[PDB]
Design a protein around this ligand. Structure first.
Ligand code: AGS
Lengths: 1302, 139, 140
């Protein structure tokens, strides 16, 4: 009912009965949902205006925290509900609004919360189902109703309508089931195939009518035949009704099949093999496959039962046997089924053993349909057969390596050319990195040849002309004009329109370009996570929206071009398009300053190039642009080249450039750039022995001097200082804090400006300070040297910490300060205790963070910690009377949690104790958001604003749950020391049962959780991780007691062992638990003998059911492929990260896979550095790889290209070595965490754990370490890891654990 | 060439690239190119090429953080087997022996010795087989 | 002041090492043609191709500047690419068509096609043609 109002007073009059910009946006989000599509279009126009009205402020709403804004999240929901309109115009208006929004990073977007594609299954057996009858009514509505309007169709339609009225009462439970309304008025009115498709069957509907007459005879049931006869009159009346009828007719044909009908079904497969009308026939074959899936659902119901139905299922299997999945895949390739085709190809390999090469040729075609980043090349690596030269050129394209070998693809064309288009692909290689000179030679060659591809080359030349920004280039564009235009060519045509000064006529052409984007948008609509895949296409649309803003200026929100680029997720391919768009915008401007800006845009492209590597190509890009010279910009180009090679040689060139830059004047950023060059020089100084570390320290001081304000210069100096301080001790230790304090002061200055990098560095600096305080207390006890002299240094450090605290923002400390606090509590206390009080003030700033800390404090005797908590409570009371009261309410909530933890099918513990239910009922305890791993994580401070971005952001930002209490009886999972799970109603009202298990520690899990998803935040930042588009699951446990840790159960969680048991049950193969006991292993088993016995038992025990499980997980062939992609995300790099830690050894039963997409989970992986593996049996594989599980992930090939990509992602994690090092130090550092497994320590440590931290550094190195003597390659390590899982002997060494035959 | 030949040389180019994992994939591919499980070639040059591939594999194993010394010795034995006469197979074996000798010593001169004697005999055989690695072998 | 003489001196030397020293010696980095002279000392085709492209982007008044890009195509040594460069060059050089045709003829020698040889043979150049004139003798 609520609507945008022309007059504020009319809205106000509605408002008083109904009852700042963000609230307006919230009303706008309600507005975006539309009761009426026509109403929505007016709302969309208002929404586009609202975004314009927000202007720079809308950008400010967009940027404030590194974590995506929640208000943006409402905006993100608006994008989900945005340009998806059946009306082209309605979708276009929504798209225009999205363009004003610009493109969020897919990684930046946090909206995985929505159910999206997942839903209860639509399929029902039918006829019995009201919905199938409703579907027949739906078939009667629209085109059958239009057919009913035609008199000849109507007599058949009326008979069908009367039959439908006879079949189903119009009333009134059926009427309630029925949509009714106009349909109710319609309901009152109602009251093996050669011939098909070919010849008489024609365009599907005629074929369906012939099929329907055969089908009515074919169905065993008279009622099914009667329904078919009613359907046949409807099928004649409407082609669409006939298509709906055919799926039902196929189900009737499945229920009863004539032997001739079975031959006809074979004929239909032949007709599908024989297959506009052919596309409709391909759709009909897909519909037949969909009918087969419906039959499979009926077969699954027959399978669920326990005879004739089994025989019918066997007949359906026989029809499936008559169909050839490989033939279906070949038809699917004609269909361009792609992932659905790949599933058919995978089915064919499962259906019949095939030569790996024979599978590979189909697979290479499948890879091209997949457009997988590995694509053909990933398939080729799997293939044991060397590629055909044309196939190899396709594989090079799948690699998309570009650069060198672009000529080689051309060279294969040179040896022979069968395709003008193949030559055109060589021409795209000739363009290479946008080289105009190569393009001009190519254009003349293209002209001599006559081809549609040659015309496409002219269109490519028009794109080159757009790069040229030349009127003569526009004349070449005119030569392209009057010829069919590629969408990129159309973008060139829009550039021609800018030369045209068409203005509104140009805008209409832009609308036509928008329509091509809309066709991409139709491709874009799909299962959830489709948008991340289509985000790059969306980015091209966003570039078009920016171009439209440029066109409006030519005709003459903030809409900064740089701002739009920052908002967009950055990928090397994406950056190249963005750079081209930026170059085009500079080209359109005639300003000399705009020409200087174009060189700056090329420099921005060069920074994107540095991310994309291709450093020679990037140097080429600088040559392609250039001018508008900046001494810093030239140095930056040299630095990117230096990073690829000769970094020291580039640095010497940079020093010469710096001398040219400075004889004085800061010149704004350029002085900061000079400091950055000094920081690069410092890295070079670390690289060179001849470079002097003291001199580098002097250079670092100079860089700090160039900008006192920049956080990065101080942070880099602090990092250099930290390395210098370790070097100065040279392991001396002893005096160290005063030097550390100077480094800390640089770190504090960097922290005060703030940085996303700085926050990780600051936590490490704080940890170092805590270690120094512990060392000082130990020194005072030792009496070594002077205890007072050490104390005086510690006191100065404490004074520095207090000054740092005033600069410090509690939101800025965020999660790290809380993680630091568990490590922070110490016997020495004193100045360290005062530092703990500053931590307590941070705890005061976020109640939830304090609540998590309190639960840990409760498990520990924490006599000192409780006193510290009491001091924090006094501080909280000082901060507010309410803040002290909230802490008391939290304590009461903790007591209720403790009663749940004790846990003295579904048990009414709340019914059992009145007080626990009463506490849940009481609102006196402060409302508590249900704990979430995401909820626990603090919202990141925004990269765009160095200081106060965290302060503006919620230190942790999420919708906050208010406890609604819990059901009196909650079912609890049963295990020895079983966790008991009950779900409090959410303020949202979603309830998740959380179970705390004795012998499980929530705090130990929490430390693992805190490390967990640090990579996930990095993955959202990483372009490659975004390309993977794979979330990393984080377990959340919130139980105060050390003995019991409570985690709400993941929805759809599957034990890997439980799934295997289910698979054995599905097979019906039975292995006795006693029979497994009957197999006997000597503790001193011969290694060969144990492996041989294990292999024979394993092959019988586990024929792989993983492929079957994947098929069960997604009904759609494409959906199953998406689930397989989720499986590829599962384990893989996440399994590798656990392997790099060396800590995990999760039980297969412990491991959980989400039912919808299958996602790997590790549960209770207490062992660290394989301490568990060292105990008893030790397993060589870093990550357990069940052979059947590997086979299901493998589909046609078990080895995963995504898994290889995951190893590359692990290398990226290695690239953030410092973040990883800080996390490893933290795990050892926390008192609650045990390095070696709090009455003992009211205010664990492992020597092996410190060695393990060195081992983690070795894991970052990728050095084998185990191999004697010895040179580490991440790709080789990933292959080795695959080998370790692969070896039977490694499985033999493992005892129990996965314990899997496959 | 059906045998990797220049493609085997391309694996050497991969060594020029310096990526061990790519080189290892090339080495498996090279063994496959002569045969899925190629026998040492009846042609002496083809057999020598197979031995050269084994020598490349030994260099790759040295590059690898984890390698089996016995496995490296087996590859060296195979290279010696393809040509007792070829200098390269003996020279590669001698280089493998020197790495083995440091391990055999285990930092002790006394621990090294029987292995050293075998290595010296291989070095003499390599010098006889070719003078190109002979000067290095002689030192 | 000396560098301008030096750049001429390096060319007379025809020595990369002398050229490299000059590039380090110069206070101001070589740009455009000066950058191109540096590229020849560098000996890297990808850098040269980029340099030729950058020079063309600033201006395309020199057949020789086109020829250096053609030399980069020769470094690529792809027959299809060389032909593509040649076709573009023939249209571009209205004033001097076939000036790089002799370079194309060497490419034709790489092509090893008699018909490809015939197109070069049809072309007439008043030049020694280096190896390519010998190739013309090879053509029959
Ligand atoms: N979402 C979940 N639903 C149910 N049980 C879960 C879930 N997540 C972890 N679990 C664990 O599942 C156990 C039940 O036994 P299994 O499913 O065989 O696994 P497990 O090996 O005992 O798991 P742990 O305790 O995590 S090592 C309980 O001890 C729980 O801790």
């Amino acid at each position: 009912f609520l609507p945008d109002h022309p007059e504020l007073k009319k809205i106000k009059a509605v408002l008083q009965e109904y009852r700042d910009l963000q609230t307006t946006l919230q009303l706008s989000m309600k507005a975006i949902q539309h009761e009426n599509v026509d109403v929505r279009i007016h709302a969309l126009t208002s929404l586009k205006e609202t975004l314009y009205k927000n202007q720079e402020k809308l950008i400010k709403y967009a940027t404030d925290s590194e974590t995506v804004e929640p208000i943006i999240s409402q905006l993100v929901t608006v994008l989900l509900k945005g340009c998806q309109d059946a009306n082209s115009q309605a979708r276009l208006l929504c798209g225009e609004c999205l363009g004003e929004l610009g493109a969020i990073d897919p990684g930046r977007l946090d909206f995985s919360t929505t159910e999206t594609q997942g839903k209860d299954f639509t399929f029902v057996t039918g006829v019995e189902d009201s919905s199938f009858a409703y579907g027949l009514l739906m078939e009667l509505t629209r085109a059958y109703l239009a057919y009913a309007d035609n008199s000849r169709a109507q007599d058949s339609a009326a008979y069908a309508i009367q039959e439908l009225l006879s079949i189903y009462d119009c009333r009134h439970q059926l009427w309630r089931r029925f949509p009714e309304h106009v349909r109710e008025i319609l309901e009152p009115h109602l009251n093996k195939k050669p011939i098909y498709l070919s010849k008489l069957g024609s365009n599907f509907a005629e074929w369906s009518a012939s099929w329907a007459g055969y089908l009515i005879t074919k169905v065993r049931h008279d009622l099914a035949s009667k329904i078919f006869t009613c359907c046949s009159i409807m099928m004649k009346h409407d082609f669409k009704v006939t298509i709906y009828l055919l799926p039902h007719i196929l189900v009737y044909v499945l229920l009863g099949c004539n032997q001739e009908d079975q031959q006809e079904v074979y004929a239909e497969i032949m007709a599908v093999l024989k297959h506009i009308a052919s596309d409709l026939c391909q759709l009909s074959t897909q519909t037949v496959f969909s009918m087969l899936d419906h039959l499979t659902q009926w077969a699954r119901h027959k399978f669920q039962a326990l005879t004739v139905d089994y025989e019918d299922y066997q007949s359906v299997t026989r029809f499936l046997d008559l169909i050839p999945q490989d033939t279906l895949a070949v038809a699917s390739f004609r269909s361009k089924a792609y992932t659905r085709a790949v599933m058919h190809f995978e089915s064919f390999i499962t259906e019949k053993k095939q030569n790996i090469q024979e599978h590979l040729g189909f697979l290479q075609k499948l890879y091209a349909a997949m457009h997988e980043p590995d694509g053909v090349a990933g398939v080729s690596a799997i293939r044991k057969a060397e590629p055909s030269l044309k196939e190899q050129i396709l594989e090079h394209e799948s690699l998309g390596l570009l650069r060198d070998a672009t000529a080689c693809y051309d060279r294969a064309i040179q040896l022979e050319p069968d395709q003008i288009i193949h030559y055109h692909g060589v021409v795209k290689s000739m363009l290479g990195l946008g080289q105009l000179s190569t393009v001009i030679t190519q254009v003349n060659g293209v002209h001599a040849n006559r081809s549609e591809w040659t015309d496409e080359l002219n269109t490519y030349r028009v794109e080159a002309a757009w790069k040229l920004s030349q009127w003569d280039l526009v004349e070449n564009y005119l030569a392209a004009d009057g010829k069919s235009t590629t969408w990129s060519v159309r973008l060139g045509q829009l550039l021609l329109s800018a030369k045209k000064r068409d203005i509104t006529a140009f805008y209409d052409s832009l609308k036509l370009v928008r329509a091509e984007q809309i066709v991409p948008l139709s491709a874009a609509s799909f299962e959830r996570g489709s948008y991340q895949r289509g985000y790059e296409y969306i980015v091209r649309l966003h570039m078009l929206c920016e171009l439209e803003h440029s066109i409006k200026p030519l005709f003459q929100d903030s809409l900064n071009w740089v701002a739009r680029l920052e908002m967009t997720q950055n990928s090397y391919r994406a950056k190249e398009p963005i750079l081209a768009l930026r170059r085009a915008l500079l080209s359109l401007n005639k300003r000399p300053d705009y020409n200087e800006m174009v060189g700056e845009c090329w420099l921005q492209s060069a920074r994107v190039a540095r991310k994309a590597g291709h450093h020679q190509t990037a140097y080429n890009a600088l040559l392609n642009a250039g001018e508008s010279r900046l001494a810093e910009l030239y140095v930056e180009r040299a630095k990117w080249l230096w990073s690829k090679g000769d970094v020291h040689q580039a640095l010497i060139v940079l020093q010469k450039g710096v001398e040219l830059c400075f004889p004085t004047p800061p010149e704004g950023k350029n002085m900061l750039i000079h400091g950055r060059a000094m920081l690069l020089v410092g890295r070079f100084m670390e690289e060179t022995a001849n470079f002097e570390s003291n001199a580098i320290m002097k250079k670092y001081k100079d860089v700090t001097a160039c900008l006192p304000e920049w956080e990065d210069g101080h942070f880099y100096l602090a990092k250099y200082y930290d390395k210098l301080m370790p070097m100065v001790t040279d392991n001396k230790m002893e005096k160290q804090g005063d030097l550390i304090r100077y480094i800390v002061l640089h770190f504090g200055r960097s922290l005060q400006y703030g940085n996303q990098f700085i926050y990780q560095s600051m936590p490490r600096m704080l940890t170092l300070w805590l270690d120094y305080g512990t060392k000082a207390y130990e020194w005072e006890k030792a009496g070594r040297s002077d205890r007072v002299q050490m104390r005086n240094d510690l006191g100065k450090i404490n004074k520095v910490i207090t000054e740092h605290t005033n600069y410090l923002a509690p939101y800025q400390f965020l999660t790290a300060f809380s993680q630091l606090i568990s490590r922070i509590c110490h016997s020495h206390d004193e100045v360290f205790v005062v530092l703990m009080e500053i931590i307590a003030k941070v705890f005061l700033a976020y109640p939830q963070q304090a609540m998590w800390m309190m639960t840990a404090v409760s498990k520990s005797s924490y006599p000192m910690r409780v006193n510290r908590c009491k001091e924090i409570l006094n501080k909280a009371i000082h901060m507010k009377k309410s803040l002290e009261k909230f802490v008391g309410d939290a304590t009461r909530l903790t007591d209720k949690l403790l009663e749940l933890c004790n846990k003295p099918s579904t048990l009414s513990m709340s019914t059992h104790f009145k007080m626990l239910k009463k506490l849940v009922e009481e609102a006196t305890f402060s409302e508590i958001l249900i704990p979430l791993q995401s909820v626990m994580i603090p919202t990141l401070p925004s990269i765009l604003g160095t200081h106060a971005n965290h302060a503006s952001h919620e230190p942790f930002p999420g919708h906050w749950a208010y406890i609604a209490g819990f059901d009196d009886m909650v079912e609890i999972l049963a295990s020895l020391q079983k966790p008991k799970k009950i779900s409090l109603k959410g303020s949202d009202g979603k309830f998740y049962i959380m179970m705390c298990k004795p012998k499980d520690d929530l705090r130990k899990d929490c430390r693992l959780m805190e490390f967990n998803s640090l990579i996930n935040k990095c993955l959202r930042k990483d372009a490659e991780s975004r390309r993977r588009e794979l979330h990393i699951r984080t377990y959340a446990v919130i139980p105060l007691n050390d003995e019991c840790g409570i985690i709400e159960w993941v929805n759809n969680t599957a034990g890997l062992r439980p799934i295997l048991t289910k698979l054995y049950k599905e097979k019906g193969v039975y292995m006795t638990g006693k029979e497994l006991r009957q197999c006997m292993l000597p503790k001193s088993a011969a290694l060969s003998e144990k492996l041989k016995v294990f292999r024979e038992f394993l092959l019988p025990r586990h024929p792989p059911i993983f492929h079957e499980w994947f098929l069960r997980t997604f009904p759609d062939p494409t959906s199953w492929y998406s689930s397989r992609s989720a499986y590829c995300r599962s384990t893989a790099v996440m399994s590798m990260v656990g392997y790099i830690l060396g800590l995990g050894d999760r039980h297969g039963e412990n491991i959980l896979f989400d039912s919808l997409t299958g996602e790997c989970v590790h549960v209770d992986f207490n062992c660290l550095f394989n301490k568990g593996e060292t105990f008893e049996v030790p397993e060589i594989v870093p990550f357990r790889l069940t052979h059947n599980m590997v086979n299901g992930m493998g589909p046609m090939g078990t080895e995963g290209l995504f898994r290889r990509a995951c190893e590359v992602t692990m290398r990226l994690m290695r690239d953030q070595r410092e973040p990883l090092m800080s996390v490893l130090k933290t795990f050892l550092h926390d008192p609650l965490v045990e390095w070696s497994k709090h009455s003992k320590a009211p205010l664990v440590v492992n020597e092996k754990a410190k060695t393990h931290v060195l081992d983690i550094e070795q894991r970052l190195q990728g050095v084998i370490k185990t191999r004697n003597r010895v040179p580490l390659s991440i790709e080789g390590h990933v292959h080795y890891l695959i080998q370790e899982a692969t070896d039977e002997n490694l499985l033999c060494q493992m005892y129990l654990g996965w314990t899997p035959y496959m | 060439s059906r045998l990797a030949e220049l493609y085997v040389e391309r694996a050497k180019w991969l060594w020029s690239k310096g990526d061990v994992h790519q080189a290892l994939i090339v080495l498996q591919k090279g063994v496959e190119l002569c045969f899925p499980e190629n026998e040492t070639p009846p042609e002496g040059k083809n057999m020598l090429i197979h031995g050269r591939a084994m020598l490349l594999v030994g260099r790759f194993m040295e590059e690898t953080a984890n390698f089996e010394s016995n496995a490296i010795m087996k590859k060296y034995k195979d290279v010696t087997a393809c040509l007792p006469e070829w200098e390269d197979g003996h020279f590669y074996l001698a280089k493998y022996y020197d790495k083995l000798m440091p391990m055999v010593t285990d930092n002790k001169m006394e621990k090294q010795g029987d292995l050293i004697r075998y290595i010296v005999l291989h070095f003499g055989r390599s010098l006889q087989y070719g003078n190109q690695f002979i000067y290095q072998s002689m030192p």
